[PDB]
Enzyme design. Structure first.
Site, PDB file in Angstrom:
ATOM      1  N   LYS A 191       0.843  -1.217   0.000  1.00 57.41           N
ATOM      2  CA  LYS A 191       0.000   0.000   0.000  1.00 57.41           C
ATOM      3  C   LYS A 191       0.869   1.255   0.000  1.00 57.41           C
ATOM      4  O   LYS A 191       1.682   1.472   0.897  1.00 57.41           O
ATOM      5  CB  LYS A 191      -1.019   0.045   1.138  1.00 57.41           C
ATOM      6  N   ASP A 198     -14.823  -4.104   9.551  1.00 55.92           N
ATOM      7  CA  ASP A 198     -15.067  -4.072   8.100  1.00 55.92           C
ATOM      8  C   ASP A 198     -14.941  -5.479   7.536  1.00 55.92           C
ATOM      9  O   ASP A 198     -14.349  -5.686   6.472  1.00 55.92           O
ATOM     10  CB  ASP A 198     -14.115  -3.063   7.406  1.00 55.92           C
TER      11      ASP A 198
END
Lengths: 298, 270
Positions: free
Chosen positions: A34, A128
């Site tokens: 990322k 999530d």
């Protein structure tokens, strides 16, 4: 640092950056990167990245995607993670005409609950859990990923961020505006996921908050003070909600046996105080042909 | 084993991880020896000012204590800091802590602003990265005040054993916190584990049996700390305790979690 990796493929994008598949030149090792472009950021190191990094530094478990390194290389911050094959969403979709075999469904759930039991014992809410954040490899492993929305919880909790969990996987205590939520919200998401592996259809595929609640109500029955002490005093409860009767799980999840049905039913309890824990779920009979209790010391 | 049987996990497991995280988060009472140009009252002045910015911005006590902890731990990795670098290192520890802890933290330009011109956004940006890398991104400690949170929950535990739902008196919590806020101002507090500091403060407002029941420490775990805390408790007792405040925009059930500021510097001299 960055010289020795090379980007093979862009595999994702969110608010705070871009995800790459990357390969080590003569190690052969593949990683997910990322990339945050700090020059582009207006509050530096986004809060989500600070939390994702700090939390995962202390969460080393076979069923939790490993954070391998953090590299600051000017104007940019890279998080380096183990790379996994694919995504439970993509695996479910590929298997939709055939079905995922029951033993694999059971294995995946067991491993998900082990990784989640671990987060919860270390006082981390994932918040999530949805099939695209569950990553699988070619050897039968599954792991919890994308801790960009997670947070440490205190004892006791206080009011946290209300805009949490993807709609389809969101627990009724969040949808009904409860002051407090806890670990019970992640178990809800896994109970939705379990049924989804079984049916190959999302359990509660809402298109708005009220449609989501009504989908839940129509399947599990409209909650009242008996099943859920306090529901009627919750900020977004309405006395006008229709009163649906609970649907029998024989029809909701046909492929499931009695153990599977019982487990699933305990994972979708309305009352967060009664909804099964990840740890207690591991001891469920559904998992007899998988696991055994460790000797009990008093 | 002060924790009840847990509805979300193994209480033995939860408490043990809590105890053991307390042993990866190393603190050093003599760290200012690495900074010969600094004196302990600079550290206290810096920490006292952070408490006041927290109150102005209605940030949570947990965010002050994170910032306090990031500051103390960062400085131990560092070697020759000057008085004039302190405000940068402190407001930047606060910036990291507020991003971690608050739903809607103050913006970076707000953290620049409260230094009255002394630190720019770009400098807070440079510094937060220095702090986080130096801490190896270990930014999840159990702070002094989180232990007090834990202890107060157990104190007020029902026969309906849910520890995660807040269920204690706001006004008594504030009064113990105010003692801990004084004790953090003195750098020798760092000799006692955070959980001991919080246990010793609670003891001073209660007893050994309460202390013991809510934080599984026997009195001898606490005795040394209690002795060191003695003067601070007395100064507080002498002055009397503060009243619970209301804060605009903050829910009343959350009011005791808002960081406050009093003239602790005056109190620290005695």
């Amino acid at each position: 640092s960055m010289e020795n990796f090379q980007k093979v493929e862009k595999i994702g994008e969110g608010t705070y950056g871009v995800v790459y598949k990357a390969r080590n030149k003569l190690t052969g090792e593949v990683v997910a990167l990322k990339k945050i472009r700090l020059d582009t950021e207006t509050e530096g190191v986004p809060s989500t990245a600070i939390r994702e990094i700090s939390l995962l530094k202390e969460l080393n478990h076979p069923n939790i995607v490993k954070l391998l390194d953090v590299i600051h290389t000017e104007n940019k911050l890279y998080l380096v993670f183990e790379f996994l094959h694919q995504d439970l969403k993509k695996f479910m979709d590929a298997s939709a005409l055939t079905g995922i075999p029951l033993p694999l469904i059971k294995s995946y759930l067991f491993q998900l609950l082990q990784g989640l039991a671990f987060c919860h014992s270390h006082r981390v809410l994932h918040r999530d859990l949805k099939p695209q954040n569950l990553l699988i490899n070619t050897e039968g492993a599954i792991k919890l990923a994308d801790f960009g929305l997670a947070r440490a919880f205190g004892v006791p909790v206080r009011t946290y961020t209300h805009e949490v969990v993807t709609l389809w996987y969101r627990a009724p205590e969040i949808l009904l505006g409860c002051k407090y939520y806890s670990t019970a919200v992640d178990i809800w998401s896994l109970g939705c996921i379990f049924a989804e592996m079984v049916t190959r259809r999302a359990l509660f595929p809402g298109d708005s908050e009220i449609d989501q609640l009504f989908r839940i109500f129509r399947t599990l029955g409209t909650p009242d003070e008996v099943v859920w002490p306090g529901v009627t005093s919750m900020p977004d409860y309405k006395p006008s909600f229709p009163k649906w009767a609970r649907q029998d799980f024989s029809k909701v999840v046909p492929p499931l046996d009695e153990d599977g049905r019982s487990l699933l039913s305990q994972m979708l309890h309305y009352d967060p105080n009664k909804r099964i824990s990840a740890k207690a779920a591991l001891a469920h009979p559904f998992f007899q042909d998988v696991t055994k209790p460790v000797p009990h010391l008093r | 084993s002060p924790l009840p049987v847990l509805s979300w996990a193994n209480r033995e497991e939860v408490w043990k991880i809590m105890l053991n995280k307390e042993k990866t988060y190393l603190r050093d009472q003599h760290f200012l020896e690495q900074h010969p140009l600094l004196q302990p009252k600079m550290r206290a002045i810096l920490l006292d000012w952070l408490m006041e910015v927290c109150e102005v911005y209605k940030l949570h006590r947990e965010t002050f204590y994170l910032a306090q902890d990031f500051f103390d731990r960062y400085m131990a990795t560092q070697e020759n800091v000057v008085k004039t670098l302190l405000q940068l290192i402190g407001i930047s520890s606060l910036f990291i802590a507020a991003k971690l802890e608050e739903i809607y933290p103050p913006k970076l330009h707000q953290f620049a602003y409260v230094t009255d011109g002394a630190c720019s956004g770009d400098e807070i940006l440079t510094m937060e990265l220095m702090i986080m890398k130096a801490l190896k991104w270990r930014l999840s400690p159990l702070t002094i005040v989180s232990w007090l949170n834990v202890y107060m929950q157990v104190a007020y535990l029902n026969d309906l054993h849910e520890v995660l739902l807040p269920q204690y008196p706001q006004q008594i919590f504030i009064q113990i916190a105010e003692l801990l806020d004084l004790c953090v101002l003195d750098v020798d507090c760092l000799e006692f584990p955070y959980g001991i500091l919080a246990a010793s403060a609670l003891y001073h407002f209660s007893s050994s049996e309460l202390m013991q029941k809510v934080s599984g420490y026997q009195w001898c775990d606490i005795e040394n700390c209690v002795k060191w805390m003695v003067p601070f408790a007395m100064v507080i007792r002498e002055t009397g305790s503060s009243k619970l405040k209301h804060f605009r925009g903050v829910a009343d059930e959350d009011a005791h979690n808002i960081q406050t500021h009093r003239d602790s510097l005056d109190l620290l001299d005695k």
